[PDB]
Structures are given as structure tokens and as C-alpha cells.
Amino acid sequence: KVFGRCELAAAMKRHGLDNYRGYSLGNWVCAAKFESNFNTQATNRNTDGSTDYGILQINSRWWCNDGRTPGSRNLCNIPCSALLSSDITASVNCAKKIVSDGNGMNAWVAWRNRCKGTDVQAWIRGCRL
């Protein structure tokens, strides 16, 4: 599923992300924009053989099992395929552990490079929330 901007923000807010670990809604929507372009089915392979999945591009090295990342952890205790679903629950639940890990939203490189210190509120402007 390709979410619209406001649509995604509204699902994210329901799933309890607005100001989760102090990160306003606009951060999360900006992050999804730059990580997957709001496509739940986005996958991208890394030089190390790990793969990023879904809307928030969660990596198989640490967070999910994809059965092809040899020395990896499955910290989210979920098959990586569950992260590509049109229902964001699993992606949102795993993101909540990632962000809690100690490096905050820095764990998402598109956030760090394209959202971090920008006017993220712009990403929710206009939406009924």
C-alpha cells in the first residue's frame, strides 16, 4: 500500500507514535517519506547482505528474520515479510523498540540527513488529526 501523507499520519497517531520518546508526529511522517516514499512494500538490499523492509525500512541484521542474513538478530521477533503489510502495526511496534535503543531517530539515516533539524511540522500541515 502507498499511503497518502495525511492518511499515514492518522494511522501513526492511532498507533501511538505522536511524541513517542519525545519525537513529534512530523518526524515519523518525514522519516517514512524519505525511507520508502510511503510504500509499505519497499525493500532495499545493503552491501552487507542485510535488507531494509517496509515503510520505515527496518533492517534484517538486527530487527527481523528474513532467513538470509547470517549473523543476525531478530529483536522484533517477527518475519521481515510482516513489515511489508498494508497494516502498519508490526512496523510501528518494531520502530518503538528501535527508537528506544539509545540513538533515537538517528537509527534511520534518511531521518538524520533529511528530517533532523528541518520544520517537520510541515509534514502534518493540513491534516485532520
Backbone angles phi, psi at 58, to 5 degrees: -75, 130
| Chain CA centroid to CA 76, Å | 13
* Technique that determined the structure: X-ray
Residue 94 cell numbers, joined: 518494531
**58-91 exposure pattern, b = at least 16 Cβ within 10 A, e = fewer:** bbbbbbbbbeebeebeeebebebebbbeeebebb
- In the set 7, 18, 48, 52, the catalytic residue is 52
Bridge pairing between strands 58-59 and 43-45: unpaired
For residue 64, what are the contacts with CB-CB under 8 A and spacing of at least 6? 53, 58, 74, 76, 78, 79, 80, 82, 83, 94
Give the count of domains, the chain.
1
119 is in an annotated binding site: no
Can you give the CATH number for the domain in which 52 is found? 1.10.530.10
- Could you tell me the resolution of this structure in angstroms? 1.9
- In the set 7, 35, 66, 87, the catalytic residue is 35
CA–CA gap between residue 28 and residue 20 (Å, rounded): 10
**Domain region containing 77:** 1-129
35 classed as catalytic: yes
